[PDB]
């Protein structure tokens, strides 16, 4: 319904959950450091990189297992809207932007396990074919 959807959609906003990985390590360059993030975290590959007002907008990419680089399909989200939610696999992440080039590392491996069936993007909501 109109109101059925609504309630649900809110449910869907909040799903940056599961047991997160708390530690991301980053690089550190005197140029990088400056325009660094606020908080960057993950539970999945669905990773959030929040930004301060006064922190530039990098462009970040993922390092697939190939080791070679790739570009993630990302988006930013938030009331803050600053954060960039990326929806592609990768441990590391580069965070280029012209000369400069950071590269936060994600740091978790529960290997060989993790897969389930979300059943949408975020598990809150669901797909009930039409």
């Amino acid at each position: 319904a109109a109101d059925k959807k609504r309630i649900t959609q809110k449910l869907k906003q909040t799903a940056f959950a599961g047991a997160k990985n708390y530690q991301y390590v980053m690089s550190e360059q005197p140029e990088m450091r400056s325009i660094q993030p606020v908080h960057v975290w993950d539970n999945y590959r669905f990773t959030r990189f929040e930004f301060p007002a006064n922190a530039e907008l990098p462009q970040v990419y993922m390092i697939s297992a190939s080791g070679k680089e790739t570009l993630p399909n990302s988006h930013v989200v938030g009331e803050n809207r600053n954060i960039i939610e990326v929806e592609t696999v990768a441990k590391e992440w580069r965070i280029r932007l012209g000369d400069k080039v950071v590269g936060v590392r994600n740091n978790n491996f529960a290997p060989g396990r993790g897969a389930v069936a979300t059943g949408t993007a975020s598990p809150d909501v669901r797909r009930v074919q039409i």
């Binding site: 909040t14 690089s27 360059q29 908080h39 960057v40 009331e79 280029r96």
Partner: peptide, 28 residues
């Protein structure tokens, strides 16, 4: 012959400080 691509600008691997500052909350 030809040239290839130049391997990527590689970030500091040596220095490594943690990302996060305070602890994250959900915004959205």
């Amino acid at each position: 012959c030809s040239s290839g691509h130049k391997p990527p600008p590689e970030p500091d691997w040596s220095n490594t400080v943690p990302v996060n500052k305070t602890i994250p909350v959900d915004t959205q």
